Amino acid sequence: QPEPDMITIFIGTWNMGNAPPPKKITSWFLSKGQGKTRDDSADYIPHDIYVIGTQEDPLSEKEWLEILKHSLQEITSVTFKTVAIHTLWNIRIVVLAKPEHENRISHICTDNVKTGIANTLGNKGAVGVSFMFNGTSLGFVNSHLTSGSEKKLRRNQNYMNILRFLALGDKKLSPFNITHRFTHLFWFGDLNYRVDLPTWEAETIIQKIKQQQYADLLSHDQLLTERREQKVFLHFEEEEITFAPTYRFERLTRDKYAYTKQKATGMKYNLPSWCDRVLWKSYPLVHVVCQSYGSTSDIMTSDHSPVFATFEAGVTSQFVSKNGPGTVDSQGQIEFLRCYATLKTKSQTKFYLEFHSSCLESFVKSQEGENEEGSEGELVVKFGETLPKLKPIISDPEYLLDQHILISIKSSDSDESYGEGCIALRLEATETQLPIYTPLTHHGELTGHFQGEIKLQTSQ
Numbered sequence: 001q002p003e004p005d006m007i008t009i010f011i012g013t014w015n016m017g018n019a020p021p022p023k024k025i026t027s028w029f030l031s032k033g034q035g036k037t038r039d040d041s042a043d044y045i046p047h048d049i050y051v052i053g054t055q056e057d058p059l060s061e062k063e064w065l066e067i068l069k070h071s072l073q074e075i076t077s078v079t080f081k082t083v084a085i086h087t088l089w090n091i092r093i094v095v096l097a098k099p100e101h102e103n104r105i106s107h108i109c110t111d112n113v114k115t116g117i118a119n120t121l122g123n124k125g126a127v128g129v130s131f132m133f134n135g136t137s138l139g140f141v142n143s144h145l146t147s148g149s150e151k152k153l154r155r156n157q158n159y160m161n162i163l164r165f166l167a168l169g170d171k172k173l174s175p176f177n178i179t180h181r182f183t184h185l186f187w188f189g190d191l192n193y194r195v196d197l198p199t200w201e202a203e204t205i206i207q208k209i210k211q212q213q214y215a216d217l218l219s220h221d222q223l224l225t226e227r228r229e230q231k232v233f234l235h236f237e238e239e240e241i242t243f244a245p246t247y248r249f250e251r252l253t254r255d256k257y258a259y260t261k262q263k264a265t266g267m268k269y270n271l272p273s274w275c276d277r278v279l280w281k282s283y284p285l286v287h288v289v290c291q292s293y294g295s296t297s298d299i300m301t302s303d304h305s306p307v308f309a310t311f312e313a314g315v316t317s318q319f320v321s322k323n324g325p326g327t328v329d330s331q332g333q334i335e336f337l338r339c340y341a342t343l344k345t346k347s348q349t350k351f352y353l354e355f356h357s358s359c360l361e362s363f364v365k366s367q368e369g370e371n372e373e374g375s376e377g378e379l380v381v382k383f384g385e386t387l388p389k390l391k392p393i394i395s396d397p398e399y400l401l402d403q404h405i406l407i408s409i410k411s412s413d414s415d416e417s418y419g420e421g422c423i424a425l426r427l428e429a430t431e432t433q434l435p436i437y438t439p440l441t442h443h444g445e446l447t448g449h450f451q452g453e454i455k456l457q458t459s460q
């Protein structure tokens with residue numbers, strides 16, 4: 001029975017509003033309602049992996065798992081296996097997979113981050129899960145960020161705290177945060193970004209939603225505007241939104257948006273907003289295609305509607321050769337030519353690189369580069385032709401061309417990373433000098449660039 005080169009992944013996010021779910025929630029897992037929806041002809045075809053993020057979840061883990069498994073079994077006639085479940089306060093993540101995937105899944109990690117300080121510590125934060133699916137690493141983050149229309153900068157801070165401190169994936173990738181540790185990273189939840197229009201425009205916004213005219217609302221969505229200004233979720237993707245705002249509804253109908261200030265809201269307005277979102281980041285040139293992104297219309301126990309997103313995701317097999325794993329394959333080599341880093345830093349330490357990849361036996365530390373002054377007042381660190389030749393464990397091009405090299409540029413004085421990035425080995429040619437490029441980030445913000453040429457030797 002062959003190993004897959006593609007799987008499908010369901011991502012769900014639902015802020016349950018502290019209420020139990022209705023008896024039927026199958027529309028969520030079928031990607032039916034508003035937006036980009038799944039074709040009826042696929043209804044019986046199970047996804048490989050289902051990842052369910054809840055916020056304001058009032059259920060026990062047992063209660064919710066029973067509902068989820070019975071829902072999927074009704075749809076698919078498949079009894080899913082529980083990969084992971086992790087809850088922080090009322091924020092929860094569940095990972096279910098087809099039973100045929102049980103021996104494909106390993107290295108399961110869970111973690112949480114609590115955001116805020118004092119007043120603001122005690123109900124917001126994130127839960128996450130990571131694991132290996134054959135040769136592919138998968139990470140999943142469910143975050144419930146700070147609420148309120150005037151707190152977008154707090155949400156951005158919550159995002160940075162979560163990606164700095166959530167401890168998922170391979171701990172040997174010590175310079176790298178979760179935005180570089182996975183082949184595919186999915187980040188979803190009640191991100192709580194609002195449509196930034198005046199309170200006086202509430203009824204106008206409602207009108208627009210009734211007309212399915214979302215363009216003038218999406219142009220004020222705080223998450224889209226913050227992402228365009230590179231304030232949050234740098235280098236993440238989001239499918240186009242074609243569904244109505246998923247917050248704030250009167251419960252037990254979807255006919256009414258409840259936006260007016262009440263004692264129960266702390267006398268805050270809740271204009272209709274896309275609070276409930278799914279974003280992703282995959283390594284360069286890895287197949288990832290969003291096949292649905294929408295909201296349900298028929299689950300009305302909460303003041304939020306559930307959101308679904310589904311993806312085709314490229315995966316690779318657990319490769320064995322006669323040589324690696326357990327030795328190098330001398331028919332393989334990775335050379336970096338004429339490389340230089342450009343850094344936004346004011347510092348004047350010397351810098352060195354670290355190369356990390358599961359195609360290496362262990363990470364590789366370069367010599368220090370040569371600092372020069374850039375024309376427009378930046379630091380250029382030149383490595384020339386000084387970089388160590390990397391010795392992959394397997395030379396077969398069917399393996400090596402699917403791999404990636406993570407790069408960290410570190411201070412010689414402090415050994416701290418000033419920037420992290422990723423280079424694909426999915427090249428147009430082997431035995432050929434070819435341009436490479438990655439942006440560099442640290443704590444998920446832009447700190448520079450790395451560019452140069454690569455020359456990849458495979459056994460072919």
Ligand SMILES: Cc1ccc(OCC(=O)N2CCOCC2)c(C)c1
Nearest residue numbers: 081082083084085097101102105106
């Ligand atoms: C499909 C699959 C499911 C679980 C699993 O390992 C983890 C496990 O067995 N757990 C017990 C129940 O709670 C979560 C942890 C693996 C390797 C594959």
